[PDB]
């Protein structure tokens, strides 16, 4: 019998999990998703994701694929999986895909949104889904300071010591910093990311926005190539994986990025 | 020695509490806030709220007052109090007020926003802070159908049986329904509300918006004076107390209502 390969759009609140990746030590998003899919499929299912997210990080645009011998209507993979999942994980859509699709290796870019709540006093609504930053932030100054990161660049100054890639070079396709009321949102897209690149970049933009560092400091850090000179890694709770690019031949759905009320 | 009367703006995620009031409940917002204030004041503190909220309901614009013999700087009533509160409750501001102020009796109106997530599939991010409604809604149709609620009206058809008020008559100051992407937001302001009035109005508005009841139905239910004819009470999860009106002489802070990214 045929082995079907299926892609899913997954959303999750990452606050009650210890990251995406399944392992034998702590609760993960992947384990809950695999248990729900196996219930529907009536066999053990293994999923492969576009981008693993660390503990506390959320997703609206995560994509996975899996193989199954189970033939089913689209309802099974959407309503059925969601009925079996906890309330903080959900399928957004299902698409059957060709055998040559791979949620990680077919992807050509990933995009993240980082949500900062900027006030002296901490927030209570979505408290583990926003990062509280105490001192006032100048979002326009952060925006202008971030534009130098566009294109192919050596991201050694924003790279964690644990990254195992052998090159620190990546291509940032866009970067935007905007204020929405008391919130400051960082939107960044690249082909791929070195370990903790997004949160490292946000951590330093935060020092520029608070006026602890100049507007040209990001250009300066980039040029100086040393992660010890850059700001501490920003907290996990404001980060969302919001979109993954794939070739148009796969025709995957593209529902709103969000999180929540933000526009595409 | 003076007795000081202090007002605070309070925000809370209601999902882990069984409503505001501590009476008859193991888990309440009021208990947590009174424990926090008693520790800062070094004496037992009792707070009085502008509008009690039911189990699961949220607040961004709640206001309380309390009396204390403790003379403290504004930081103790904000940072100090927040240090003694759980992560899902927070003080937004402090203001000393005259003796004649009462968070309930000085208020002239309360305003709520109700957030509906209107996709076929349920959400995962902010799952206990939005109401999932699976049938497609026509927000403009809901808006038009709601306007007959304006002004002084007998809200019998939208009142729960547990309401003990004399008169079911209240004054609806405004009501609007707008779509924001996949979300539908009901914004309603009245001098005061009867029990379950907001959630009962929203329940019937969603039936109209889904084309299950005619656009005239809200006016027909209003005139019928029988809550058994009206739709089921909408879920608590999407409801937020976002603002309370007080006379200008009190000069109370008016920070963003949200929740989250919604503009004022
Ligand atoms: Cl990161
Ligand atoms: Cl209500």
UniProtKB/Swiss-Prot annotation, chains A, B:
CDD domains: PseudoU_synth_EcTruA (cd02570). Gene3D superfamilies: Pseudouridine synthase I, catalytic domain, C-terminal subdomain, Pseudouridine synthase I, catalytic domain, N-terminal subdomain. Residues 101-105 are annotated as: RNA binding. It is an enzyme of class 5 (isomerase). Signal peptide: none annotated. Substrate binds at residue 112. InterPro entries: PsdUridine_synth_cat_dom_sf, PsdUridine_synth_TruA, PsdUridine_synth_TruA_a/b_dom, PsdUridine_synth_TruA_C, TruA/RsuA/RluB/E/F_N. One of its GO terms (biological process) is tRNA pseudouridine synthesis. The keyword Isomerase applies. HAMAP family: TruA. Belongs to the tRNA pseudouridine synthase TruA family. Homodimer. Formation of pseudouridine at positions 38, 39 and 40 in the anticodon stem and loop of transfer RNAs. This is tRNA pseudouridine synthase A. The lineage of its organism: Bacteria, Pseudomonadati, Pseudomonadota, Gammaproteobacteria, Enterobacterales.
């Amino acid at each position: 019998p045929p082995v079907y390969k299926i892609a899913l759009g997954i959303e999750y609140d990452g606050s009650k999990y210890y990251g995406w990746q399944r392992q034998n030590e702590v609760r993960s998003v992947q384990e809950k998703l695999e248990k729900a899919l196996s219930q529907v499929a009536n066999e053990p299912i293994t999923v492969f994701c576009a981008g693993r997210t660390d503990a506390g990080v959320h997703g609206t645009g995560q994509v996975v694929h899996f193989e199954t011998t189970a033939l089913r209507k689209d309802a099974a993979w959407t309503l059925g999986v969601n009925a079996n999942l906890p309330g903080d994980i959900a399928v957004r859509w299902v698409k059957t895909v060709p055998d040559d699709f791979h949620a990680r290796f077919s992807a050509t870019a990933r995009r993240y949104r980082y949500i900062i709540y900027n006030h002296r006093l901490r927030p209570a609504v979505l408290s583990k889904g926003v990062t509280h930053f105490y001192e006032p932030l100048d979002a326009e100054r952060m925006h202008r300071a971030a534009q130098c990161l566009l294109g192919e660049n050596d991201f050694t100054s924003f790279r964690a010591v644990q990254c195992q890639s052998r090159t620190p070079w990546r291509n940032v396709m866009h970067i935007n910093v905007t204020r929405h009321g008391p919130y400051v949102v960082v939107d960044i897209k690249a082909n791929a990311f070195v370990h903790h690149m997004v949160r490292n970049i946000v951590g330093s933009l935060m020092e520029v926005g608070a006026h602890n560092q100049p507007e040209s400091w990001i250009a300066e850090l980039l040029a100086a190539k040393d992660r010890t000179l850059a700001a501490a890694t920003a907290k996990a709770e404001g980060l969302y994986l919001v979109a993954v690019d794939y070739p148009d031949r796969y025709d995957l759905p593209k529902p709103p990025m969000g999180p929540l009320f933000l526009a595409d």
